[PDB]
């Protein structure tokens, strides 16, 4: 309902220019097509789709931001092409049987935390025509090892001496909370490992709960204090100009930053070591169970 | 209920060292006294009060953080002195008739936004002994003129061109929202003006809704784009070592930062000009009505 969410998303240039570049550089995907923008917000993606030659764009949003979108569409003289519908995409009546293309920015922290993927897959199954397309079409989640004894002390050991008083019992409440924040790439001590690969054409809501063994190729002898998670978004199907962006620490900052799982017990690793563990994501809000160096912890965000 | 609020408050050194210094440098205020900590959190102020020679400290908190406080008090071997009570200070039964000293950190953004002052004044009226003391005892709110055409363009004019599309109608929704953020002291273009003076010994919840004429002595010929608000906290009554801290832009950053009211229509001012306006605060959440250069706007936070 709040303009603040839409301001931060629109001011993320990696995000918004990626969608803009996909749409403007692949207009053959949109030309004379019926396009559904799931959770359209201000209507920015509906308007990209219209300028790329869409026959009809249906922007749907459940929130009061749609009333801003109605006015914005009119200011840009696209009400001829873009029809806006207020309500849950699961609930509303659409004035078409079927759509050629679905577009959405559905992605949460660590891809899946408080994500809309559920609503997009509903829209796909209800409304996507035989041989239609969904964008972005491919997503991955990666983990990477971190060494940052200073940031670990600042969040954990901090509680041992607070202006002369012991507050040690507070550490049990901090460890299980994933942190969202921009990591210094200098603190990465492994190659990343892919733990999940989603093609939005072939996935179901049940595929989004997963387990993966992983191996982190250690590149620096150090104390491992944390595992960081991020995701890569690809526009591929039928593209003459493929688009990708990363939310990883070695790439430009996005409003997603990185998701960080602090280790209760940091442990030493050696350059050339293959660090083996297991990660499981449950949908329930989202939880991440991490097994590493013969201990297991469950995190939430 | 969440550790995150308490972490940010405890890591604010201006805040926490101010309370620590008041209590440790004025132990004659606490010696053999019965002390009530309203909204005690982790119990940090209860423990300061105990080390300064308190006969009995009653820490009261409505939230689950009290269960952490019960353990923390035990880790520091002060359960002899500090009794912790779970519930609203308005509701709970205290094991005393009366208290000598009330201590609290009740202060919101711009002092009064989502502040606990209501609950402390209830505690004062119910439980403060004849000739008892409340700390901090004196608070002020100040306004100051700002020139920052770049930050104003980044929040307002931004909406006129969003990746080639007009979103101008969004400005009406942004202007009425106070911003909390740390100002560059280089962007201040007036002496501050005091608009409110609270002595917690002599105020009532009705005094917290106020109107004030103000005069801002302009120090730099410029465009005025915003009015900023902040507050100063004083520990005075019976102190051999008075303590004060500011949340103003010319002082060290606190977790309160500054509250900024963006002007819909920036206007030019001349060094030596006495800029006259009127501010009114209503309790309702909090609203701030501002009259300046012959236009009025109501803000919320
Ligand atoms: N970028 C994000 N994309 C996820 C998705 C973000 S809502 C996108 C839009 O869809 C709407 N909608 C949702 N479910 C719907 C439904 N079933 N049917 C119809 N509409 C539906 C909804 O009203 C909204 O307008 N996520 C996100 C992740 C991390 C941080 C932030 C963030 C950052 C900064 C701030 Cl200040 C606030 C938030 C945002
Ligand atoms: N520093 C602040 N002090 C105001 C007050 C802050 S609660 C203090 C404590 O009193 C409790 N309580 C409240 N009403 C009560 C009652 N009637 N009876 C009994 N207990 C009561 C409550 O459970 C809590 O534990 N405010 C504040 C202002 C601006 C920003 C932030 C902030 C910054 C960062 C983050 Cl991550 C989160 C929040 C905090």
UniProtKB/Swiss-Prot annotation, chains A, B:
UniProt protein name: Protein arginine N-methyltransferase 3
Q: Which residues form the SAM-dependent MTase PRMT-type domain?
A: 1-301
Q: What is known of its domains?
A: The C2H2-type zinc-finger is responsible for substrate specificity.
Q: Which residues of the full protein are shown?
A: 225 to 530 of 531
Question: Source organism lineage?
Answer: Eukaryota, Metazoa, Chordata, Craniata, Vertebrata
Assembly, per entry: Monomer and homodimer. Interacts with EPB41L3 (via FERM domain); the interaction is direct and inhibits the protein-arginine N-methyltransferase activity of PRMT3. Interacts with the 40S ribosomal protein RPS2. Interacts with ALDH1A1; the interaction is direct, inhibits ALDH1A1 aldehyde dehydrogenase activity and is independent of the methyltransferase activity of PRMT3. Interacts (via zinc-finger) with ZNF200 (via C-terminus); the interaction is direct and required to localize PRMT3 to the nucleus and inhibit its proteasomal degradation.
| Result of altering residue 179 to W | Reduces catalytic activity
Enzymatic class: transferase
List keywords of the entry alphabetically. Answer: Acetylation, Cytoplasm, Metal-binding, Methyltransferase, Nucleus, Phosphoprotein, S-adenosyl-L-methionine, Transferase, Zinc, Zinc-finger
Q: Which residues form the active site?
A: 105, 114
